[PDB]
Design a protein around this ligand. Structure first.
Ligand SMILES: [Mg+2]
Ligand SMILES: [Mg+2]
Ligand SMILES: [Mg+2]
Ligand SMILES: [Mg+2]
Length: 46
RNA sequence: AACGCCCCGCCGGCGGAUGCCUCGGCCCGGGCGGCGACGAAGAGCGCGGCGGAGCGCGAGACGCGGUGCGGACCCGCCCGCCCCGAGAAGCACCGGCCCUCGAACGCAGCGCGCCCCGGCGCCGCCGCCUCGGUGCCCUGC
């Protein structure tokens, strides 16, 4: 023992493994490419 | 004087009483007694062919689908429907979609992380896995 300090030991850590899915159906969002673009702007400067 | 001011007989203003009318209030009785981590109540911001407030709805947005009933309209301009079903207005139930904050849950409030595969809040109960103790013992050494 080269250190005078008691530290919590190291124990095995597991990963998540749910019994049932939290999001059974994959759903879309706002980020579809065609809906992302709205419309062009039309002016003489443009 | 005459004008001005103040008092009768007609006509005009200004104002809004009165009378009549009201899809509104107030009281009494009866029923009901049903919200939420499967994300509530509340807030913000968006959504209409021409669209400000209110209602409604949520990037599937002024609504989508199913099953029954209904049977000619759709407040403006348009578009649509028209028929022994071919289907406008309406009504009931059922299935889904459901942006940001909020008990509000990776941190923070509009910015930024960890992670290796996708996901990452707290407290409790039960169960399991991996461990600590000069606690009570035991064995071997
Ligand atoms: Mg969507
Ligand atoms: Mg409005
Ligand atoms: Mg949040
Ligand atoms: Mg927070």
């Amino acid at each position: 023992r080269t250190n005078v300090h008691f530290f919590r030991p190291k124990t095995l850590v597991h990963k998540k493994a749910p019994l049932y899915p939290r999001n059974p159906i994959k759903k879309g969002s706002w980020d579809d490419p065609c809906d992302l673009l709205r419309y062009p702007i039309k002016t003489d400067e443009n």
